[PDB]
Design a protein around this nucleic acid. Structure first.
Ligand SMILES: [K+]
Ligand SMILES: [K+]
Ligand SMILES: [K+]
Ligand SMILES: [K+]
Ligand SMILES: [K+]
Ligand SMILES: [K+]
Ligand SMILES: [K+]
Ligand SMILES: [K+]
Ligand SMILES: [Mg+2]
Ligand SMILES: [Mg+2]
Ligand SMILES: [Mg+2]
Ligand SMILES: [Mg+2]
Ligand SMILES: [Mg+2]
Ligand SMILES: [Mg+2]
Ligand SMILES: [Mg+2]
Ligand SMILES: [Mg+2]
Ligand SMILES: [Mg+2]
Ligand SMILES: [Mg+2]
Ligand SMILES: [Mg+2]
Ligand SMILES: [Mg+2]
Ligand SMILES: [Mg+2]
Ligand SMILES: [Mg+2]
Ligand SMILES: [Mg+2]
Ligand SMILES: [Mg+2]
Ligand SMILES: [Mg+2]
Ligand SMILES: [Mg+2]
Ligand SMILES: [Mg+2]
Ligand SMILES: [Mg+2]
Ligand SMILES: [Mg+2]
Ligand SMILES: [Mg+2]
Ligand SMILES: [Mg+2]
Ligand SMILES: [Mg+2]
Ligand SMILES: [Mg+2]
Ligand SMILES: [Mg+2]
Ligand SMILES: [Mg+2]
Ligand SMILES: [Mg+2]
Ligand SMILES: [Mg+2]
Ligand SMILES: [Mg+2]
Ligand SMILES: [Mg+2]
Ligand SMILES: [Mg+2]
Ligand SMILES: [Mg+2]
Ligand SMILES: [Mg+2]
Ligand SMILES: [Mg+2]
Ligand SMILES: [Mg+2]
Ligand SMILES: [Mg+2]
Ligand SMILES: [Mg+2]
Ligand SMILES: [Mg+2]
Ligand SMILES: [Mg+2]
Ligand SMILES: [Mg+2]
Ligand SMILES: [Mg+2]
Ligand SMILES: [Mg+2]
Ligand SMILES: [Mg+2]
Ligand SMILES: [Mg+2]
Ligand SMILES: [Mg+2]
Ligand SMILES: [Mg+2]
Ligand SMILES: [Mg+2]
Ligand SMILES: [Mg+2]
Ligand SMILES: [Mg+2]
Ligand SMILES: [Mg+2]
Ligand SMILES: [Mg+2]
Ligand SMILES: [Mg+2]
Ligand SMILES: [Mg+2]
Ligand SMILES: [Mg+2]
Ligand SMILES: [Mg+2]
Ligand SMILES: [Mg+2]
Ligand SMILES: [Mg+2]
Ligand SMILES: [Mg+2]
Ligand SMILES: [Mg+2]
Ligand SMILES: [Mg+2]
Ligand SMILES: [Mg+2]
Ligand SMILES: [Mg+2]
Ligand SMILES: [Mg+2]
Ligand SMILES: [Mg+2]
Ligand SMILES: [Mg+2]
Ligand SMILES: [Mg+2]
Ligand SMILES: [Mg+2]
Ligand SMILES: [Mg+2]
Ligand SMILES: [Mg+2]
Ligand SMILES: [Mg+2]
Ligand SMILES: [Mg+2]
Ligand SMILES: [Mg+2]
Ligand SMILES: [Mg+2]
Ligand SMILES: [Mg+2]
Ligand SMILES: [Mg+2]
Ligand SMILES: [Mg+2]
Ligand SMILES: [Mg+2]
Ligand SMILES: [Mg+2]
Ligand SMILES: [Mg+2]
Ligand SMILES: [Mg+2]
Ligand SMILES: [Mg+2]
Ligand SMILES: [Mg+2]
Ligand SMILES: [Mg+2]
Ligand SMILES: [Mg+2]
Ligand SMILES: [Mg+2]
Ligand SMILES: [Mg+2]
Ligand SMILES: [Mg+2]
Ligand SMILES: [Mg+2]
Ligand SMILES: [Mg+2]
Ligand SMILES: [Mg+2]
Ligand SMILES: [Mg+2]
Ligand SMILES: [Mg+2]
Ligand SMILES: [Mg+2]
Ligand SMILES: [Mg+2]
Ligand SMILES: [Mg+2]
Ligand SMILES: [Mg+2]
Ligand SMILES: [Mg+2]
Ligand SMILES: [Mg+2]
Ligand SMILES: [Mg+2]
Ligand SMILES: [Mg+2]
Ligand SMILES: [Mg+2]
Ligand SMILES: [Mg+2]
Ligand SMILES: [Mg+2]
Ligand SMILES: [Mg+2]
Ligand SMILES: [Mg+2]
Ligand SMILES: [Mg+2]
Ligand SMILES: [Mg+2]
Ligand SMILES: [Mg+2]
Ligand SMILES: [Mg+2]
Ligand SMILES: [Mg+2]
Ligand SMILES: [Mg+2]
Ligand SMILES: [Mg+2]
Ligand SMILES: [Mg+2]
Ligand SMILES: [Mg+2]
Ligand SMILES: [Mg+2]
Ligand SMILES: [Mg+2]
Ligand SMILES: [Mg+2]
Ligand SMILES: [Mg+2]
Ligand SMILES: [Mg+2]
Ligand SMILES: [Mg+2]
Ligand SMILES: [Mg+2]
Ligand SMILES: [Mg+2]
Ligand SMILES: [Mg+2]
Ligand SMILES: [Mg+2]
Ligand SMILES: [Mg+2]
Ligand SMILES: [Mg+2]
Ligand SMILES: [Mg+2]
Ligand SMILES: [Mg+2]
Ligand SMILES: [Mg+2]
Ligand SMILES: [Mg+2]
Ligand SMILES: [Mg+2]
Ligand SMILES: [Mg+2]
Ligand SMILES: [Mg+2]
Ligand SMILES: [Mg+2]
Ligand SMILES: [Mg+2]
Ligand SMILES: [Mg+2]
Ligand SMILES: [Mg+2]
Ligand SMILES: [Mg+2]
Ligand SMILES: [Mg+2]
Ligand SMILES: [Mg+2]
Ligand SMILES: [Mg+2]
Ligand SMILES: [Mg+2]
Ligand SMILES: [Mg+2]
Ligand SMILES: [Mg+2]
Ligand SMILES: [Mg+2]
Ligand SMILES: [Mg+2]
Ligand SMILES: [Mg+2]
Ligand SMILES: [Mg+2]
Ligand SMILES: [Mg+2]
Ligand SMILES: [Mg+2]
Ligand SMILES: [Mg+2]
Ligand SMILES: [Mg+2]
Ligand SMILES: [Mg+2]
Ligand SMILES: [Mg+2]
Ligand SMILES: [Mg+2]
Ligand SMILES: [Mg+2]
Ligand SMILES: [Mg+2]
Ligand SMILES: [Mg+2]
Ligand SMILES: [Mg+2]
Ligand SMILES: [Mg+2]
Ligand SMILES: [Mg+2]
Ligand SMILES: [Mg+2]
Ligand SMILES: [Mg+2]
Ligand SMILES: [Mg+2]
Ligand SMILES: [Mg+2]
Ligand SMILES: [Mg+2]
Ligand SMILES: [Mg+2]
Ligand SMILES: [Mg+2]
Ligand SMILES: [Mg+2]
Ligand SMILES: [Mg+2]
Ligand SMILES: [Mg+2]
Ligand SMILES: [Mg+2]
Ligand SMILES: [Mg+2]
Ligand SMILES: [Mg+2]
Ligand SMILES: [Mg+2]
Ligand SMILES: [Mg+2]
Ligand SMILES: [Mg+2]
Ligand SMILES: [Mg+2]
Ligand SMILES: [Mg+2]
Ligand SMILES: [Mg+2]
Ligand SMILES: [Mg+2]
Ligand SMILES: [Mg+2]
Ligand SMILES: [Mg+2]
Ligand SMILES: [Mg+2]
Ligand SMILES: [Mg+2]
Ligand SMILES: [Mg+2]
Ligand SMILES: [Mg+2]
Ligand SMILES: [Mg+2]
Ligand SMILES: [Mg+2]
Ligand SMILES: [Mg+2]
Ligand SMILES: [Mg+2]
Ligand SMILES: [Mg+2]
Ligand SMILES: [Mg+2]
Ligand SMILES: [Mg+2]
Ligand SMILES: [Mg+2]
Ligand SMILES: [Mg+2]
Ligand SMILES: [Mg+2]
Ligand SMILES: [Mg+2]
Ligand SMILES: [Mg+2]
Ligand SMILES: [Mg+2]
Ligand SMILES: [Mg+2]
Ligand SMILES: [Mg+2]
Ligand SMILES: [Mg+2]
Ligand SMILES: [Mg+2]
Ligand SMILES: [Mg+2]
Ligand SMILES: [Mg+2]
Ligand SMILES: [Mg+2]
Ligand SMILES: [Mg+2]
Ligand SMILES: [Mg+2]
Ligand SMILES: [Mg+2]
Ligand SMILES: [Mg+2]
Ligand SMILES: [Mg+2]
Ligand SMILES: [Mg+2]
Ligand SMILES: [Mg+2]
Ligand SMILES: [Mg+2]
Ligand SMILES: [Mg+2]
Ligand SMILES: [Mg+2]
Ligand SMILES: [Mg+2]
Ligand SMILES: [Mg+2]
Ligand SMILES: [Mg+2]
Ligand SMILES: [Mg+2]
Ligand SMILES: [Mg+2]
Ligand SMILES: [Mg+2]
Ligand SMILES: [Mg+2]
Ligand SMILES: [Mg+2]
Ligand SMILES: [Mg+2]
Ligand SMILES: [Mg+2]
Ligand SMILES: [Mg+2]
Ligand SMILES: [Mg+2]
Ligand SMILES: [Zn+2]
Lengths: 107, 95, 70, 97
RNA sequence: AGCCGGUAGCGGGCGUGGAUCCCUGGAUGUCCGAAUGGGGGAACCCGGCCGGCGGGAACGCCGGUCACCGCGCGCGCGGGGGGAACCUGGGGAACUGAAACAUCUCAGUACCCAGAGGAGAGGAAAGAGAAAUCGACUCCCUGAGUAGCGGCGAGCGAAAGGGGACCAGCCUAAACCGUCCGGCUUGUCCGGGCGGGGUCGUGGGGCCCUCGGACCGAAUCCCCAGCCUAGCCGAAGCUGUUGGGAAGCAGCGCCAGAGAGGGUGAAAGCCCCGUAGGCGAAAGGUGGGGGGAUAGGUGAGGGUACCCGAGUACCCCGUGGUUCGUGGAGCCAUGGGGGAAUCUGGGCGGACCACCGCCUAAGGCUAAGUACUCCGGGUGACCGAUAGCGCACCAGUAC
RNA sequence: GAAUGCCGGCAUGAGUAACGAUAAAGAGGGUGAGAAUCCCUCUCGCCGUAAGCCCAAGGGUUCCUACGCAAUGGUCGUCAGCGUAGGGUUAGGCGGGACCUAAGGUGAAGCCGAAAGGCGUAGCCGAAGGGCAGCCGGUUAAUAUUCCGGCCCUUCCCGCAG
RNA sequence: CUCUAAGCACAACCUGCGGGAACCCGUACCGCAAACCGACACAGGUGGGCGGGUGCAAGAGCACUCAGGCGCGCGGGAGAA
């Protein structure tokens, strides 16, 4: 089947565990195969790069490292709180994610 | 659907192949089951020339390995075609 | 090829006749041969074109075969 | 040594039993078996030739069912067997079996 | 809401106007293989006929078609090969045991061959066997290591009856009647098809005479419930502290038809996937449950003595099966020889005879209850990389 | 803790035997981080009915070029039948098939056998035997009776003439 | 090559001239050997053809030598048993 994952690309999340616990950012990318996400400005690693074209000075570059998807919590755009995700069926027949606290949509 | 364009696969790029261009000889990779009569027809409707001679030969695939795994490249077949005097295949010419 | 273009190609082909579908298939096969020549001499950067054209020929043959079976 | 074409009699496996001694009912201590060996018993197969509808048909049958061959020929008096090959006669004859 | 398999890179693309992916149906499907146009050292060569392509007559390619056997009337239908175990039939060892060995045992086992199928076999009394009793078959417990068999050695080993599972009974041949065809030994004739009639042991049926004259219901067909092949919803937690990291520890809370389990940077009912509880199919498969239809089935008296499965019963010779190894040796089966009758006929109740009883041979079919595990799921006082399958890994591979 | 047990690891013998024909080597120069061992040159020796050249089988890319030097090579290695990459085999006349038969195999007919199967006429298969039209030279790093040049030839189709 | 039978004799066959047609597979390299059979780059085994010159009576024998190919994939010293 499919990798059921509670967050999606483009939504704001809270890092609730680990070194960067308490930080807030936007999901850059989602890695269902690794069950991981990438959050802007979070979990920056230093990577050694060789001297070459497009890396003339070599040295080190900085990149975000993926986080396990259970460490992030989506933030409601209505009540502004981290929350669990509920399913709400719309009168037009579509299904959307809603915040488990106040019921607001999560897009 | 089999056509003339399924018979001719690609040109052969080598010094030996380039040498025959001056004499009107052109080397192609062709379908391994294609016959000389089949090949001669295919070149005529693909490049609009007159073909007067077709030579063929089988090219067995080389055994190659990547790390631990042994295998083989696919078998191939190339054809050298001689066009009528004065005629040219401008797609191959210029390389 | 976009999803909308695929629907257009299938819609146009179903309006044709078996004689026309064979002629269109042959022109597409000729176009694919010219791509293979370009890709052989390292002059096709957009290598995705080869897969797009191959699936188009499969679509036209699938539609042609449906018309043959009535 | 094969099957009987009418009754299906075929060879059967039987035991040959060699005995010694005097029987109990004749005042002896009893029979003793010195040897048992497997053998085959065959039907008494014989060739029977009959003339049916201008053709000669050959039957391989057990001797006990030879009169059944002529029973079949008589019951074929009410069949249309004109111009058929001997093989075709035999198949028609055996469909009456 | 991401995606272009394992699988990154170079290089390019697609997707909320619904991609990738999953399920169902369809299309395409080179060559070999039962292999089947012919040949052949499998995967490779060579043809016939019809149509098309190339300038196409020679040459080549493309599409269709062409093996053999059986049955039904050149056409139509079928067969062939394969399948881990299980099943039936045709054949069928030895080591070993007997503390040697030959009857016996191992054993009708191993194995070979043929066939059947999701099962197979068996199956509707010419039965059982002593009770004036039972009532097709199969399977389980028991009877019972009993009755018996046995160089009466080693050993082998029932059945009836009782308790359960399941449950179901039918179609024909023959008498007689009709119709078509063939015969000449030319008709109350014989023979071969087909239709009607008939199916039984408290004997039944045919024919003649009399009185008679809607209920049952499929193992077949139709429809539906349900089930299978993708899925969906799903309660409740925060803060601090040690620490690389909290889920640990602490403070105060909440859910529970959910405190199975697995993840998350250590040890989380409330973070994630789930769990209890609910929901869901356009399409194909199944449908042993329910409903309907249909085939089919349906009473007595008197006369007659027409019919009731033949190289069969039966007797003898040679053998097999049964607990039965020639034994007082029946019963069932049959290679050889002889060889009946149609109910006043026949078979059986362990030699045989008499009496007293039971049954109706020589045509066929038949669900369910039972066996097995290639395959899918669940579960272990099962294994944890010398273990567990030979293989946790690119293994029936390297060699 | 023992089964000349089983699997694996590592010791001893020991820096020991041996390094596979007693046809044999020497020098100068070059290359290279590195040279008895690779390249060039001069000298020497060995084979020469062979240790030279060409077919068939068998083997299956080992062929040529470039770049390498961990393992392989009984030492060494800059070399290589080794590692990586690219390239390379061209036929109407050569061989085989679209021809023929041999032993043998198979086998519409036919015969036999519990089954599986055994045999067998015609026919078919079956060759290094019969049949059938190409010689000389040039060219590539690597193919040549195949490519090219010159000179020769074969079968089939169509048209015209006889 | 020749003889005729069915058939056909506006066909058919043969000769000459002109124009056309001619498919599939093999083809590298080793091949008395370091590339084949012997577990090895193994003193063994492996069918056919060519195989020069001089001399020794002849010869495919023997000695030297042509063309061609090799010094056999560990060496250097010493000069006991
Ligand atoms: K024995
Ligand atoms: K003994
Ligand atoms: K009677
Ligand atoms: K009896
Ligand atoms: K009885
Ligand atoms: K049955
Ligand atoms: K030959
Ligand atoms: K060659
Ligand atoms: Mg990140
Ligand atoms: Mg060329
Ligand atoms: Mg070819
Ligand atoms: Mg042309
Ligand atoms: Mg070729
Ligand atoms: Mg060729
Ligand atoms: Mg190739
Ligand atoms: Mg290749
Ligand atoms: Mg491949
Ligand atoms: Mg395509
Ligand atoms: Mg018999
Ligand atoms: Mg005997
Ligand atoms: Mg026997
Ligand atoms: Mg006789
Ligand atoms: Mg008899
Ligand atoms: Mg008799
Ligand atoms: Mg999108
Ligand atoms: Mg499908
Ligand atoms: Mg075939
Ligand atoms: Mg064949
Ligand atoms: Mg089968
Ligand atoms: Mg058996
Ligand atoms: Mg046997
Ligand atoms: Mg038997
Ligand atoms: Mg035996
Ligand atoms: Mg025995
Ligand atoms: Mg003994
Ligand atoms: Mg003993
Ligand atoms: Mg015995
Ligand atoms: Mg036994
Ligand atoms: Mg026994
Ligand atoms: Mg046994
Ligand atoms: Mg059954
Ligand atoms: Mg009955
Ligand atoms: Mg049962
Ligand atoms: Mg039982
Ligand atoms: Mg039970
Ligand atoms: Mg029992
Ligand atoms: Mg008892
Ligand atoms: Mg007893
Ligand atoms: Mg004893
Ligand atoms: Mg004794
Ligand atoms: Mg015993
Ligand atoms: Mg016994
Ligand atoms: Mg026993
Ligand atoms: Mg019982
Ligand atoms: Mg009837
Ligand atoms: Mg009867
Ligand atoms: Mg009648
Ligand atoms: Mg009737
Ligand atoms: Mg009666
Ligand atoms: Mg939930
Ligand atoms: Mg949920
Ligand atoms: Mg939850
Ligand atoms: Mg918290
Ligand atoms: Mg915490
Ligand atoms: Mg805990
Ligand atoms: Mg918790
Ligand atoms: Mg936990
Ligand atoms: Mg948990
Ligand atoms: Mg908690
Ligand atoms: Mg549930
Ligand atoms: Mg009897
Ligand atoms: Mg008898
Ligand atoms: Mg008797
Ligand atoms: Mg006797
Ligand atoms: Mg008897
Ligand atoms: Mg007996
Ligand atoms: Mg017995
Ligand atoms: Mg017995
Ligand atoms: Mg005895
Ligand atoms: Mg016995
Ligand atoms: Mg006794
Ligand atoms: Mg007895
Ligand atoms: Mg009797
Ligand atoms: Mg008998
Ligand atoms: Mg009777
Ligand atoms: Mg009587
Ligand atoms: Mg009796
Ligand atoms: Mg009796
Ligand atoms: Mg008695
Ligand atoms: Mg009875
Ligand atoms: Mg009866
Ligand atoms: Mg009966
Ligand atoms: Mg009867
Ligand atoms: Mg009988
Ligand atoms: Mg039956
Ligand atoms: Mg059953
Ligand atoms: Mg291990
Ligand atoms: Mg371990
Ligand atoms: Mg293991
Ligand atoms: Mg273990
Ligand atoms: Mg496994
Ligand atoms: Mg193992
Ligand atoms: Mg292993
Ligand atoms: Mg493995
Ligand atoms: Mg293997
Ligand atoms: Mg001990
Ligand atoms: Mg031992
Ligand atoms: Mg040991
Ligand atoms: Mg030990
Ligand atoms: Mg050991
Ligand atoms: Mg071990
Ligand atoms: Mg060991
Ligand atoms: Mg060991
Ligand atoms: Mg180890
Ligand atoms: Mg060891
Ligand atoms: Mg060691
Ligand atoms: Mg030591
Ligand atoms: Mg050692
Ligand atoms: Mg020593
Ligand atoms: Mg040592
Ligand atoms: Mg020393
Ligand atoms: Mg020593
Ligand atoms: Mg030493
Ligand atoms: Mg020494
Ligand atoms: Mg040694
Ligand atoms: Mg040595
Ligand atoms: Mg030495
Ligand atoms: Mg030494
Ligand atoms: Mg030494
Ligand atoms: Mg040495
Ligand atoms: Mg030495
Ligand atoms: Mg040496
Ligand atoms: Mg030496
Ligand atoms: Mg020498
Ligand atoms: Mg010498
Ligand atoms: Mg030197
Ligand atoms: Mg030097
Ligand atoms: Mg030097
Ligand atoms: Mg060196
Ligand atoms: Mg060096
Ligand atoms: Mg050199
Ligand atoms: Mg030398
Ligand atoms: Mg010397
Ligand atoms: Mg010399
Ligand atoms: Mg010499
Ligand atoms: Mg010499
Ligand atoms: Mg000489
Ligand atoms: Mg010589
Ligand atoms: Mg000699
Ligand atoms: Mg070869
Ligand atoms: Mg080899
Ligand atoms: Mg080999
Ligand atoms: Mg070898
Ligand atoms: Mg190769
Ligand atoms: Mg290689
Ligand atoms: Mg090599
Ligand atoms: Mg090479
Ligand atoms: Mg080389
Ligand atoms: Mg180098
Ligand atoms: Mg090295
Ligand atoms: Mg090394
Ligand atoms: Mg080495
Ligand atoms: Mg070396
Ligand atoms: Mg060595
Ligand atoms: Mg060595
Ligand atoms: Mg070395
Ligand atoms: Mg080295
Ligand atoms: Mg160097
Ligand atoms: Mg070099
Ligand atoms: Mg080499
Ligand atoms: Mg190499
Ligand atoms: Mg290599
Ligand atoms: Mg080639
Ligand atoms: Mg040629
Ligand atoms: Mg030529
Ligand atoms: Mg041909
Ligand atoms: Mg041939
Ligand atoms: Mg045969
Ligand atoms: Mg046979
Ligand atoms: Mg045979
Ligand atoms: Mg023969
Ligand atoms: Mg022949
Ligand atoms: Mg053959
Ligand atoms: Mg031949
Ligand atoms: Mg001869
Ligand atoms: Mg020849
Ligand atoms: Mg020739
Ligand atoms: Mg050259
Ligand atoms: Mg060469
Ligand atoms: Mg060459
Ligand atoms: Mg040449
Ligand atoms: Mg030439
Ligand atoms: Mg060649
Ligand atoms: Mg070759
Ligand atoms: Mg060569
Ligand atoms: Mg070479
Ligand atoms: Mg050579
Ligand atoms: Mg030789
Ligand atoms: Mg030679
Ligand atoms: Mg040589
Ligand atoms: Mg090799
Ligand atoms: Mg070998
Ligand atoms: Mg070997
Ligand atoms: Mg070695
Ligand atoms: Mg070797
Ligand atoms: Mg070596
Ligand atoms: Mg060597
Ligand atoms: Mg050697
Ligand atoms: Mg040798
Ligand atoms: Mg020799
Ligand atoms: Mg010679
Ligand atoms: Mg000379
Ligand atoms: Mg000389
Ligand atoms: Mg000489
Ligand atoms: Mg002289
Ligand atoms: Mg002389
Ligand atoms: Mg002399
Ligand atoms: Mg001489
Ligand atoms: Mg000689
Ligand atoms: Mg000579
Ligand atoms: Mg001599
Ligand atoms: Mg000599
Ligand atoms: Mg000499
Ligand atoms: Mg000599
Ligand atoms: Mg000599
Ligand atoms: Mg000499
Ligand atoms: Mg000499
Ligand atoms: Mg010399
Ligand atoms: Mg030479
Ligand atoms: Mg020389
Ligand atoms: Mg040397
Ligand atoms: Mg070496
Ligand atoms: Mg060495
Ligand atoms: Mg010394
Ligand atoms: Mg010395
Ligand atoms: Mg000395
Ligand atoms: Mg000395
Ligand atoms: Mg000494
Ligand atoms: Zn909210």
């Amino acid at each position: 089947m499919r990798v059921k994952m509670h967050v999606k690309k483009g939504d704001t999340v809270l890092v609730a565990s680990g070194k960067y616990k308490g930080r807030v950012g936007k999901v850059k990318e989602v890695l269902p195969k690794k069950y991981a996400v990438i959050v802007e400005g979070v979990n920056i690693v230093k990577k050694a790069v060789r001297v070459s074209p497009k890396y003339p000075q070599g040295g080190f570059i900085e990149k975000e490292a993926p986080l396990h998807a259970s460490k992030v919590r989506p933030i409601c755009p209505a009540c502004g709180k981290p929350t669990r995700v509920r399913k709400k069926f719309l009168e037009n027949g579509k299904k959307i994610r809603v915040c488990a606290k106040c019921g607001g949509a999560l897009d | 659907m089999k056509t003339a364009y399924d018979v001719i696969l690609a040109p052969v790029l080598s010094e030996k192949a380039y040498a025959g261009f001056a004499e009107g000889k052109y080397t192609f990779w062709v379908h391994p089951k294609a016959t000389k009569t089949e090949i001669k027809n295919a070149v005529e409707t693909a490049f609009k020339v007159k073909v007067v001679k077709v030579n063929t030969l089988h090219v067995r695939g080389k055994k190659k390995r990547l790390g631990r795994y042994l295998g083989k490249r696919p078998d191939r077949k190339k054809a050298i075609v001689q066009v009528a005097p004065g005629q040219k295949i401008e797609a191959l010419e210029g390389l | 090829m976009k999803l909308s273009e695929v629907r257009k190609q299938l819609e146009e082909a179903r309006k044709l006749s078996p004689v026309e579908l064979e002629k269109l298939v042959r022109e597409k096969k000729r176009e694919l041969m010219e791509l293979r020549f370009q890709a052989s001499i390292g002059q096709l950067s957009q290598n995705h074109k080869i897969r797009d054209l191959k699936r188009q020929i499969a679509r036209l043959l699938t539609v042609l075969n449906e018309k043959r079976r009535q | 040594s094969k099957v009987c074409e009418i009754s299906g009699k075929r060879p059967i496996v039987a035991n040959s039993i060699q005995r010694r001694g005097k029987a109990k009912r004749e005042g002896g201590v009893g029979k003793k078996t010195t040897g048992i060996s497997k053998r085959r018993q065959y039907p008494n197969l014989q060739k029977v030739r009959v003339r049916v509808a201008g053709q000669e048909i050959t039957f391989r049958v057990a001797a006990s069912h030879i009169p059944k061959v002529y029973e079949l020929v008589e019951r074929a008096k009410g069949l249309k067997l004109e111009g058929l090959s001997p093989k075709e006669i035999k198949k028609e004859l055996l469909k009456l079996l």
